């Protein structure tokens, strides 16, 4: 009744045996291709909500992008904060970066400078442990230990330790000697992970590395995941680009590496699942002998009887990634709001979900693709096939 | 010797009816992809288990004993008290340091401990890992310190050159002091192909007592258990018997992510591989129901010659069952050679990749091992067989309800 | 693997 | 039988006023930093230079210990003779005596008294030597095994005496005081 | 001397959604050894009778008891250890299995019996010497001829001496040289034991071989 | 008068992987207002022919020329549009298509040429209404007798048939009586328009009483 030759020859195809067990074997297909997608968006909803929370504990403090000169020091004069004018940034702050090395009355340890501004707001400010941010006084030479830093030292409030440069130092001809500085904790700061076991936070008008101006402006970025994209667009002229990888590179390397080796390992459930549309057409045209040759003797054009296979084809790949991603969406979403019988973790404490919006789609739209090259070698057999050599 | 539900359904499985080969080798290989990433699967999470073993538990103390910072006056009784406790074999002092190797512009956390290289063979295998031959005449007077690997490619330093260390200056009034930058050279370097390579070094007890200025004191006792799960209780019984509350560990709250989240992998991808045989038993399901309908006229000779519906459900289920034995026995003999032959497949793949995969800078080890067990390789075979099982039960349900009358016979 | 826990116990 | 050149010129100084140059190069054969000021060297323990346009370093000797003021971190700090390092060439000029007298072949082309061991246990393979018709010594620049070079030229020669009443160490008001004199 | 007990076996027929009767008032029975000639027309009702003899279907309307147990009245399971025994079905359409050879499908009935093994491989070589199979032991019937294809379904049937074989045209797929020697070897156990065949034939030459003549109006054999 | 220009056929089939002439010689031309009824054996070539001339293979020997075009010297998308406008085909084993409807199968060939929308409840409705299939309208063809079955396959025939229309064993499946009375409402069509169908049997009974008798007898179309 449809007025489209093409869709009216397969209509009724789909459902024509009265049991229930005729048209349960004619849709499996498509609960083989439901079933992967499923499995391909709850398990990753896990592995993005672990990305997640070491995004927000590892790359939320211990700032990622900096804007280096030449020469190492940036004249704060000569590329003032509205000549960056990037993209993917919100806020511009001076900042400076160097590795130094701790000398307390117990040990000694290592540890990353950072000089912050006492004026501007930081990320550190609501985790330290009865700190103000304004104590840091120039000319005071104060210091702000982290708690796993001044555990393993010994360092308790209103000791003196002493800081030394290793890098950038005055090669005196009395012995080659490093530029030391002593200074004094006001108190520790909390984080509970791993930035307060090296970072140390301390005035940024100090003259212990070099100098006076700083090494770069404190970038926060949108997205610190695709550094690749910001560190390869219109840099302006003395500057340069130092991201995270330096540093925590091969760190979340290892994160990516593990979401494509899960990803390829729940990715044979479309395979097998294309698989499947090759054994259930190829069944079909061997069968449909006498209902095939009878539609070129209506004046069929091949072209057009090619359609009809390909969109039993592609029907249980549309309806299949839909109801996949539906049914994906709301496991990963109830999984610890419903109830907890799913799984309990070793610590069980607000284990996180993440649903990206663009994750589900470019999901989908390949198990769309694999199931449209598993119906053309199918639907080839039953298109450029002898009408005369048929069986009558 | 074989029945008539099996011996007698071989012959009705050869039938060609014009593109019904290509059916037997996609439906084939379809099942058999399940099962050979499900035998190399298991078995490199064995091999994982395995290196664990020797390379984390063999070089690591279990006992980890911080005291108050009063250093060790009674350290001699205490060796004793825990050696007669039973669970723990050996035991032996350790110092703990903190230094930073350095040659010239570059800095590395370092972590030296002070053990007697006389007594440390007794209770974990340190120079058992250990590339060079230099692991003797380690006592004082020469001043040597052998460190791992992970520091020798940073320091771009070999064997017989003089580094420069830290130490920390030991002062009973709390003040600062200069710091000393002692001169040893290096007399070896060890390979452990993990996360202690480029933050372990160990040097003779010898040669730790003159850098504090004191004479016999350690600052740390360790020992080693036999059973090494139970490590909650057999270390609350140490502690006690040589002195009071004091700072101390084991190794299940540090080193218990490595023994954890490889069994996390025995439940994800069982799970995860069974779906992939549940889609592949629906190739069975498609062949069965053609199986019906193109020998529906075979079925009605049966009727009439005095069979039961019992003997028609027993023909069609042993009929998948033998189409699921030829594609589960082919990725079994898939899986062994890729499963014992798994060093030059992995190292192939990385020369035309660049980046090699499973870097030992913050996973376990280096290299992917495998360790074929023919445990599980018996419980895939029942699990591919009851998926077999239950997707043909319903179409030799549906062959046997079927009149005979209605059909030619 | 990608899951790290640092809750030390003394 | 040259072995006496600097040990006859060199005993009837004291002290001389003149103004320094600092000139480091690495292995690629490039300047990274520059250093001006005067230095003031007295003959039996006591040593004296600063720095004034490129860079800070305030440092003087009282006899037993080593001051080291710098203006740079606001930092004093004081240490002894004997725990730092000898080998430097800066010592020997100042000392004259057995430990000048271990090995060290001198040789003469002229002006140049570059010397080297054969069985040492420091870091300094050369140095040289230029001294005057005087009893004044002009270079005493040195290199180290890790490639880095270094010259030191002088300039506005003077010859006189200097009372020990500036060598005092007077620190600014406001610094802090460091004791690493064990 | 009668065998099973007839008494209205009123059977339907759906021919285009009409449930039109095509059997009325069947109520006539066999006798033993007396051969049944029921001449009856292919539409009419013809095969009707060759599979509600065996129980392929329910006729409704009556019960036909054969040693004291109704065909209608008992299950699936209870009328499937006499169809190998005392039964015996001889069709026209070439309904036998094209994947075994021809030892084994005249010992087809003797496999589900679950016979003894030793007397299935004797029973097998003396039944194709009845017929005439004795080169074509081992052979697949797809290749065999037309003649050569009906004398496999004559030792199908008699395996463990049935008193009545339901036999549906036997001849007119072959030549006239095996006609009357089909139903020699066939009438030759009529005076061994004393068993009987109904044949269902389209004319009336093969009608006067038979000792009974029972005519098929419209059931009414 | 002249419709299918065919010369001499020279069709070779393969059969089992060898070159063989079993259809030679066939050459016949056809015209409106006369009905030629070729006869012959069941496996002599008559049922072969049925394909060669209709346009769903062509022999590369033989080429016929309709309406003014080579059979032979034609690609695959210009031959689609021969087939559904003024040809019929007439089979004898039933194929049609279960899936479908009594009245969606006989407007099938209304559905693949794309015509009018608002044409399909009238015209495909009043060609399965003169045969005699009133009150099975919505009815599948499963459910159907032999007779029956064979009545939708004439109905989808004539839908549009100016000219050539090629049938194949109209009787057999049933009896001979009602297969008469389609043949006289089939002939009516011929002094209206013009038209003509030919039919091919076996028997002497349904040749020789249309128009005239033919026959051919392994190519020899004539002496019968
Ligand atoms: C050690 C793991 C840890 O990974 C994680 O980040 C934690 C994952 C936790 C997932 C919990 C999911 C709970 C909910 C499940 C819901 C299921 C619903 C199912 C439908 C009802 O690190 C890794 O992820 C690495 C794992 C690597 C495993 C080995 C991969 C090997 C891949 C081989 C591919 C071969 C392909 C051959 C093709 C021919
Ligand atoms: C976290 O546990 C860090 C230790 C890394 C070892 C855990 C193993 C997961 C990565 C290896 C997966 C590859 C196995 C290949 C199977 C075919």
């Known amino acids: 009744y449809q007025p489209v030759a093409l869709f009216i020859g397969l209509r009724y195809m789909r459902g024509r045996a009265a049991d229930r067990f005729g048209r349960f074997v004619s849709w499996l297909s498509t609960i083989g291709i439901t079933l992967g997608v499923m499995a391909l968006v709850t398990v990753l909803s896990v592995m993005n909500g672990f990305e997640r929370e070491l995004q927000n504990n590892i790359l939320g403090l211990m700032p990622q992008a900096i804007l280096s000169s030449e020469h190492g020091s940036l004249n704060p004069q000569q590329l003032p904060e509205t000549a960056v004018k990037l993209d993917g940034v919100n806020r511009v702050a001076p900042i400076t970066t160097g590795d130094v090395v701790l000398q307390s009355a117990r040990s000694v340890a290592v540890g990353v400078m950072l000089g912050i501004d006492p004026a501007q707001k930081d990320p550190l400010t609501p985790y330290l442990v009865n700190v103000k941010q304004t104590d840091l006084e120039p000319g005071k030479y104060n210091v702000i230990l982290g708690e796993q830093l001044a555990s393993q030292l010994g360092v308790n409030r209103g000791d003196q330790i002493r800081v030394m440069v290793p890098s950038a130092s005055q090669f005196t001809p009395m012995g080659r000697i490093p530029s030391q500085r002593l200074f004094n904790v006001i108190g520790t700061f909390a984080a509970n992970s791993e930035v307060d076991g090296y970072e140390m936070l301390v005035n940024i008008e100090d003259a212990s590395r070099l100098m006076g101006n700083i090494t770069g402006w404190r970038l926060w970025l949108d997205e610190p995941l695709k550094v690749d994209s910001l560190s390869q667009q219109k840099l302006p002229e003395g500057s340069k680009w130092q991201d995270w990888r330096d540093r925590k590179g091969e760190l979340f390397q290892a994160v990516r590496m593990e979401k494509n080796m899960m990803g390829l390992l729940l990715s044979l459930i479309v395979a097998v699942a294309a698989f499947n549309i090759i054994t259930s057409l190829g069944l079909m045209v061997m069968e449909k002998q006498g209902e095939v040759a009878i539609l070129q003797t209506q004046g069929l054009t091949p072209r057009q009887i090619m359609m009809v296979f390909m969109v039993q084809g592609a029907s249980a790949g549309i309806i299949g990634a839909i109801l996949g991603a539906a049914l994906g969406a709301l496991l990963a979403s109830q999984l610890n709001n419903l109830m907890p019988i799913i799984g309990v973790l070793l610590d069980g404490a607000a284990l996180p979900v993440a649903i990206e919006p663009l994750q589900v789609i470019v999901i989908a739209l390949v198990a769309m693709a694999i199931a449209l090259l598993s119906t053309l070698y199918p639907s080839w057999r039953a298109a450029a096939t002898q009408p005369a050599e048929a069986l009558r | 010797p074989l029945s008539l539900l099996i011996g007698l359904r071989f012959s009705r499985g050869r039938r060609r009816g014009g593109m019904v080969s290509l059916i037997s080798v996609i439906s084939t290989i379809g099942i058999a992809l399940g099962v050979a990433v499900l035998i190399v699967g298991l078995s490199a999470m064995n091999g994982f288990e395995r290196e664990l073993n020797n390379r984390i538990l063999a070089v690591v103390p279990h006992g980890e004993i911080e005291a108050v910072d009063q250093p060790w006056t009674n350290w001699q009784e205490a060796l004793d008290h825990v050696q007669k406790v039973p669970g723990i074999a050996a035991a032996a002092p350790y110092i703990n340091f903190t230094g930073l190797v350095e040659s010239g512009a570059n800095l590395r956390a370092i972590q030296v401990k002070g053990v007697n290289p006389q007594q440390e063979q007794r209770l974990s295998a340190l120079p058992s890992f250990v590339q060079g031959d230099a692991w003797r005449n380690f006592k004082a007077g020469e001043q040597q310190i052998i460190i791992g690997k992970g520091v020798a490619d940073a320091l771009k330093v070999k064997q017989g050159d003089w580094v420069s260390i830290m130490i920390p200056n030991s002062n009973p009034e709390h003040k600062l002091m200069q710091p000393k930058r002692v001169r040893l050279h290096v007399a070896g370097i060890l390979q452990l192909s993990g996360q202690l390579d480029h933050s372990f070094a160990m040097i003779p007890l010898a040669d730790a007592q003159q850098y504090l200025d004191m004479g016999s004191s350690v600052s740390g006792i360790a020992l080693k258990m036999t059973d090494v799960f139970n490590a909650n209780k057999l270390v609350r019984d140490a502690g006690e018997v040589t002195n009071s509350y004091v700072y101390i560990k084991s190794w299940i709250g540090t080193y218990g992510y490595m023994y954890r989240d490889i069994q996390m992998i025995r439940a994800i991808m069982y799970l995860a591989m069974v779906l992939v045989i549940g889609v592949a038993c629906f190739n069975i399901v498609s062949t069965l129901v053609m199986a019906v309908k193109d020998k529906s006229g075979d079925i009605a000779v049966l009727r009439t010659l005095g069979a039961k519906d019992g003997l028609i459900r027993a023909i069609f289920v042993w009929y998948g069952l033998l189409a699921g034995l030829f594609g589960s026995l082919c990725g079994v003999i898939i899986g062994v050679v890729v499963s014992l032959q798994l060093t030059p497949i992995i190292e192939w793949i990385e020369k035309l990749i660049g980046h090699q995969f499973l870097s030992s800078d913050i996973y376990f080890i280096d290299f992917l091992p495998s360790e074929l067990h023919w445990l599980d390789v018996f419980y895939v075979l029942v699990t591919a067989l009851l998926l077999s099982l239950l997707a043909s039960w319903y179409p030799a349900r549906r062959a046997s309800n079927i009149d005979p009358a209605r059909v030619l016979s | 693997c990608s899951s790290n826990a640092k809750i030390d116990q003394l | ?182 | 001397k009668i065998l099973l007990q007839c008494d209205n076996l009123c059977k339907r027929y759906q021919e285009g959604s009409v449930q039109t009767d095509v059997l009325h008032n069947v109520s006539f029975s066999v006798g033993e050894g007396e051969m049944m000639a029921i001449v009856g027309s292919s539409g009419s009702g013809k095969s009707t009778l060759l599979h509600l003899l065996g129980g392929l279907d329910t006729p409704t309307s009556g019960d036909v008891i054969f040693n004291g147990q109704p065909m209608s009245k008992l299950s699936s399971a209870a009328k499937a250890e006499l169809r190998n025994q005392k039964l015996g079905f001889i069709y026209q359409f070439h309904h036998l299995l094209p994947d075994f050879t021809a030892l084994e499908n005249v010992a087809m009935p003797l496999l589900i019996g679950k016979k003894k093994p030793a007397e299935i491989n004797s029973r097998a070589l003396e039944m194709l010497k009845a017929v005439g199979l004795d080169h074509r032991a081992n052979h697949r019937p797809s290749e065999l001829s037309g003649g050569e294809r009906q004398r496999v379904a004559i030792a199908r049937a008699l395996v463990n001496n049935p008193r009545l074989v339901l036999a549906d045209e036997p001849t007119g797929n072959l030549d006239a040289r095996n006609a009357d020697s089909i139903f020699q070897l066939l009438g030759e156990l009529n005076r061994l034991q004393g068993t009987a065949f109904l044949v269902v034939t389209h004319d009336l030459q093969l009608a006067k071989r038979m000792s009974r003549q029972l005519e098929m109006r419209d059931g009414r054999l």
């Open chain 4, 1 to 182: 039988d040259a072995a006496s050149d600097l040990k006859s010129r060199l005993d009837k100084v004291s002290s001389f006023h003149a103004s320094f140059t600092q000139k480091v190069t690495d292995g690629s054969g490039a300047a990274v930093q520059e250093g001006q000021g005067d230095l003031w060297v007295k003959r039996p323990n006591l040593f004296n230079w600063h720095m004034t346009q490129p860079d800070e370093s305030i440092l003087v000797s009282d006899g037993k210990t080593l001051w080291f003021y710098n203006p740079f971190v606001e930092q004093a700090t004081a240490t002894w003779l004997k725990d730092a390092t000898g080998n430097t060439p800066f010592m020997l000029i100042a000392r004259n005596q057995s430990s000048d007298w271990q090995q060290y072949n001198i040789k003469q082309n002229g002006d140049d008294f570059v010397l080297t061991p054969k069985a040492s246990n420091g870091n300094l393979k050369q140095f040289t030597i230029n001294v005057g018709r005087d009893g004044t010594i002009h270079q005493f620049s040195a290199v180290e095994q890790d490639d880095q070079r270094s010259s030191y030229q002088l300039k506005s020669q003077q010859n006189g005496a200097v009372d020990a009443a500036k060598f005092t160490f007077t620190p600014p008001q406001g610094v802090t005081v460091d004791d690493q004199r064990k």
